[model samples]
Target: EDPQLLVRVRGGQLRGIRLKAPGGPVSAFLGIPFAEPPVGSRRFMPPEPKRPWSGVLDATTFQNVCYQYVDTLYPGFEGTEMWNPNRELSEDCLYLNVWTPYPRPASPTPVLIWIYGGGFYSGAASLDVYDGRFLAQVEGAVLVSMNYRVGTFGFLALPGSREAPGNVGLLDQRLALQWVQENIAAFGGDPMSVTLFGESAGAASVGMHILSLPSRSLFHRAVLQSGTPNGPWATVSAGEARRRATLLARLVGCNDTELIACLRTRPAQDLVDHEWHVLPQESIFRFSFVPVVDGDFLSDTPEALINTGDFQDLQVLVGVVKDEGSYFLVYGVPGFSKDNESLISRAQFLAGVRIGVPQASDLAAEAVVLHYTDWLHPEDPTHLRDAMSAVVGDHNVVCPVAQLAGRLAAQGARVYAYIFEHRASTLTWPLWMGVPHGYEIEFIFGLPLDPSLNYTTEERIFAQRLMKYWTNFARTGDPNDPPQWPPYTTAAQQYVSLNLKPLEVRRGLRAQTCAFWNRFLPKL
Candidate 1:
């Protein structure tokens, strides 16, 4: 046991462990409580700060993951299976993890806080893919990750009740940021220089933080990957959240005059089991419980907030993968299973468009089919697959992110945008399914630094460069030391393309398609 691993914070002393890495030894404090257990009466309320402890807290091992329905693994997709939580599940999961360089840095290091993504329904900090050791050891930054409640336990909302206001998952994230602000100095981190980053729903959560008045002061920089508040699936209205919660309560046998109080008495597993019972469809795009516009955490819709310039003043880095929708198509859409290689018929493509954008009217759906269909080779199966992917990607993630970046730039905020183009060597999916969602996470966390993973030399170099770019941005507001990445503007719309080769700056990312979605489609 190394005495240097011991650290003192507001709560008490913590004994971390030193892990070996290619760059050097890194001190890893696995699990430390940032909030009191949200059990019993504390269940649907905002997370309360963890009380100060007495003796040394053993932070060598990870703690329990919050209760969520474990998703079944698809055959041949070993890479995604790694994202599942390895620890026991419980309601008392509000711990955070920290990793920093060993022997401590001479100067205060920049901080990077991560919020994981599982569509606001399923995710945890204990997954191997989110390990922070390599980034801390090689990149010289303090990395923090927190485990927040998800599924029904995190997002169930009851209007006008102080007990069950929605967006408590977001509140849990805010409490973690508060913990970092108050306690990170002891871990050799500069709280004032923190950069909040995440992917998918996690990125949407970051977007929420940026839009929130109370959360702006906690972080100075933001990075949103693939997801944003403007994504239709990211948030629901207050009434919608209440309706879903009421339905869930009835399904779990908790429908009573005292709804919130009676629901609290049901077993936690019952709540998790029935969380998705209210979803109208089987599409991956549909989520029953998510962050709600409760007027407390979120005063208005994300688009309205951005339109009125009600967001924070901070440097932002936002981007999406090349094939953001391929994974969703294979896993979520019917008749597009991984084992099936048959070409999609024209009728099937139209059905996919309808399923993807359920809010589109019949005319709007026909318009979408016309826009995405290849005029010359309209019946080509390959083209149909590619077109379907674009339809899903554009509506859900790509256009929203680009529109958000443009809107922010229009408001005079410094924003950097990018599109990750490199495909992982480890993916077992078909070649047609290009770089899918969350593929860039491995390189961002410096997973290639280890040789045993069988990454090519170029892949390793790309990972190294990615870590440098990310940490450089964390150190300063700019990610332009190694490569000259220009700032994104509404006119030029420049963005860097991340890949194994030398990075190239491209302009007008899907300009016409985005114009259709951001401008024309709204009118239709």
Candidate 2:
């Protein structure tokens, strides 16, 4: 607590933070409100700057969570598995957490704002995976994380909602960033030094921030982790959305206009239960609850956005896992054998690699079984899993990362690309996924760093190497001349690929595969 301010933090909150150590001896300040609670009338709207309460608003306990319900994931997990297990959902959920090792009465310090990811439907400022106190306490970097609307509240672009359409969540995120710009100084952070970093939807949100006119100057740098490289298949085109809305209305026995109203006012859980599997995707990795690229808010498609060099200009450190498809196979397709025609058809369509017969979804499934048996380990369940993941990864993950890298590189931006191939979660494969998306996050923050995923000595070394490189990058614009990283371009295809085998690192064998992938990539 600050001595002069007589600060007091109460509840399950992080308490306080500052950009730097104030001259009168810096200290941690704790839970501070960045915006008004996004509830009731503000439920689906953008967050508004919260008024500062005189004295100290309780910063000890966490504010009740927003309408988030993900109790179904890994039921046995310990301590607040998904959302706030201690309480129920409340509209009064817009809250932010902070950590400040440099909150002394002194010059402002660099700030790192984190945005969490939960497939766009669920995620919060405080996850066991991301307790930023260590980063703030040890790294001397002030860290702040804010909540944004997710699921229907955040997205759901209906007919009447076309003006906003579905970027309400994005707007909430922007407002939080703006709030930080205005208030971080009170906590001793240099708002200008702020860096926006997120994984998955969080990473995608970072992408949205880059594109949003309102987010300009709110953040200076952004990092996307396992971000949505290509748009998700679940995101129906605007035309399809209208059609789907009509279908939903019919299914719910409501009229077109009434559909939106009914959905908006219905108990949130009913919608979640009903449409959880409506999109027809197996894994959550390929899920979508993000703002649609309606040409107005989101502008051009990703391919166009990056190709035309229309994206935000800032140093970028972008990458994916060596086997990014590890997740699809892991948690996404684990339950049963994939002799079904549905699996085959989906894979063929996703890869855009017409194999067997286009009409024969069953034949496509056979091709998948054959590909997995032929390429990956047939004896292992991971075979089909890896192949499925590869299909989406190739088109979605690899294609976009490299494509975006090329676009940014052409403009002479400092771009660093690397593949997180460390087998941190080798044990969590079927149960979890490959060095799944966001696996590297824990390493960067240094605490709660991916549990058994990086528990091994080799994994530890790799994590250390990455953490140093990342912190160094956050300190300076460059992720530094990584140990053996490369600048990705259309030709060089140079990459910083990590792996479990030290010998593989020495041989630098990623070039061949990358070149092979180059052949598969579609032209811009």
Candidate 3:
């Protein structure tokens, strides 16, 4: 017999389906509209809540994802294994999905909300990898996923007025959280026990919510996978946003006075197609459209706000992978090509240093190259990208995340730090790619193992442990609810090193490298 589930929410009656799991059954609610469609005149404005519907809304099928230019080839498994989103695309894509083990409960279960990461330019909630059935059934908690505006449609800050103020994507995320607080009880979810988690751009959004005022008191815990709001790409200044908006207006045949109206009328594909011309020329990490300091959601920079201790006090688990920059180096190299003969020479290391440390003094660039060359020799052709990998990883991801952990711990928040060191058996590009960016996602979601990627028994063990730690943290504020683990503090400077055999606590992970970036060349 076919089974169906129904629940009453603030908007109207929602009809879902019961998905069978190994442990139990999960009530799956797909494609529920949480906000009004941001099309036409409402294209770039803040998202408004969806009005009540007259009849029972069918929500068993996943909806179209936000429009994003898909890049299927990037010279390695990082493109196919992790970055591909197999779904239809559209502009009216501000929907959310939910999964719960129990349709009705004696008491509300803890809720976990996931945000996807795509450099703030591309992402969706309907990806097959983001399915929450296993997470809800195994952990006996409620899971949620939502889509926010992206690229020019989400974050275009105009020069003069508040109507076109930037960060509509961020505003969309805020409204989703608000919806959860107001209406999650119907799905047997405890509103107060909500945890927000994301990877890369999504992780940076989690960090930004910790500082933004609109998102205050909405969540009790946060898990930032591999990005922080303090990174240079996470946010843009108001002046820089204005320059980009001006360029976009000229490209689309509009002047300053009629900019917003003209942009609203253009087709979604037209804006996304020509959006690349507005990015910073000759820059690798150029996310042209993202959160901007528009004096509303973000008044000052995230770094400045963190320094002034103006961030929310909440439990945070933040971390990065071992080789966080290997996935991004493709963009840094001109034409995405590296010769083997040059890879063995010192010139490769020096060129990488210049690319990673742009606009720095010659002495500073040389200092970084010399420091990393000690570990992996530049003369060895096999380890050339290894040396370059360290330079990019340390400068861009590792140091910035380390700095964020220290600041959050200093501000009297219970912070748990981690490093994902689980080695993969399927990546065949280069041996230097040690746990590259976004390697922990499929494991976190408990998805099926791909044929292209292989995982060891120990790696599978590590994945189960991660799911436990995450759900345990969601239930309570502590990651080590039942187990004993040390919390990260300024004095101790401890972090959990996640690996196959031993999950050990280590101190001073990349301390010297972080000091170099934090002191001399800030904001890499």
Candidate 4:
């Protein structure tokens, strides 16, 4: 049936929907469901395969977004003088949309799946920054984006709440990829030629896939952006999230055994209204809803597992921005500064570094600074971002990605590395700290950055190259470079600078100015 930009399927009285062939000289589809909704009893549980409908389903409307507040995550949406067409959202938001461009009825295309990030909390598939149509129609591939659980519904871990397991959101991602593998061929996409990519939390998920045996086989190629390979994995146990739930339950006056029951029975919105009672980011309790190092599921962090060659055979790409830590400046105050050792201590402590140094934490404030803080002149105001960038970048996005790349290279697989360095003098309101965590999202996803803010011709040029490089990577395992990109080797880190002046094999500089950090984790 030639529906509005969608391909409808009804096999055995079960109806399924995919995006219609695009209307351009090329063909395409938009907003295809990749998974059944993850609401109600299914919330936080591992995402299930989508149920089929008896009648033709509408693949027309945008899916609901996982909950995110203006302040908690991305602001500048409302009140800002700009156009953002992504207003649809809700708790029942587990669907993914596929954008495709091909010969409509027959020709096959490659697939690119994007995952957005917000610290395991807020993000969506329908944002203005995540539009995938141009990537599909212009670049000639299929682009997919899906919603995973967020905040309480996604990451909430309580006793007996395997009902709502930890890292179920990640499982949602695995299932979404499975859907693409199973269904993209119907939309003229080559499911075997799939590339999975993400930024921030999504990038973290990309690296996490390297660690999962199931995912390593599912995705042919991977790109891990700002988020890195560190883990709360080996740190605090699941007992802590349970402790948090118990504390919150007590506040709501529920007895111990009845807590999960109480939370399950309550209205989703009432839970939303009192959501502050949940751990607000990192609290004094030092809790995280991060993927646990369960041997059966996550096993170990990508860094640890990739070293064992689990993900060694796949084409791997890893990179970070010049100032990946600017996110800290926007979200919370700087921890390292000319005058404040307190925040530095707090930064180390907040990241779950044990108080005593010899206690064995990679994040010990003293050890991190001692090993990686040489590049910063602490007296300079920008040193805060520099130091924080190194810290978070190492813990969440930088080192782990490099480690994954090196592992892939060792196994004779193609590996590419990059650094996103273009930063307009005035990139955002609070003064740009170079390309921050989400700085690359709009550019890479083919979504136009806010037009109200003046964009330098240089920034525009770089943005164009970003789309090219990423799309190229999606089609072929390697970014289809004029010269095919090479594997990363120990002697030359060999990474490109994804900027207005995009060039390759940059050498001899370090993020935190430490000569050792870039060398240490990857080698291990």
TM-score to true structure, per model = 0.97, 0.78, 0.92, 0.80
Error of 2 at 397 (Å): 2.4
lDDT of 3 by residue, 4-24 (tens): 388889999989888876567
**Model 4, 190-222: lDDT tens per residue?**
877888888877887776776677876678888
What TM-score does structure 2 among the candidates reach?
Answer: 0.78
- Ranking 2 against 4 by TM-score, winner: 4
Ranking by lDDT: 1, 3, 4, 2
| TM-score, predicted candidate 1 vs. hidden true structure | 0.97
Better of 3 and 4 by lDDT: 3
Alpha-carbon local distance difference test for all models: 0.88, 0.57, 0.79, 0.60
lDDT of 2 by residue, 1-524 (tens): 54433443222223343333212222444345667776545555556777646554655444555566565545554322533334346656677776666434367878888888776777777665666655665556777887777766676565346332666777777877777776677666787777888876787678767665667679877677777434443233555555544454444545434456666566666655544444444455433344666565566565555556544367777777666554443234444222222233334333332321122255444543454343434444344444555655654466455655666777656666777766544333333344656667666666433343336666655655565566566767666543455545545656565555431222222443434444432221
Every model: Cα RMSD to truth? 1.5, 6.1, 2.9, 5.4
lDDT of 3 at 172: 90
Ranking by TM-score: 1, 3, 4, 2
TM accuracy, model 3: 0.92
- Candidate 4 TM-score over all chains jointly: 0.80
- Which predicted model would earn the best lDDT? 1
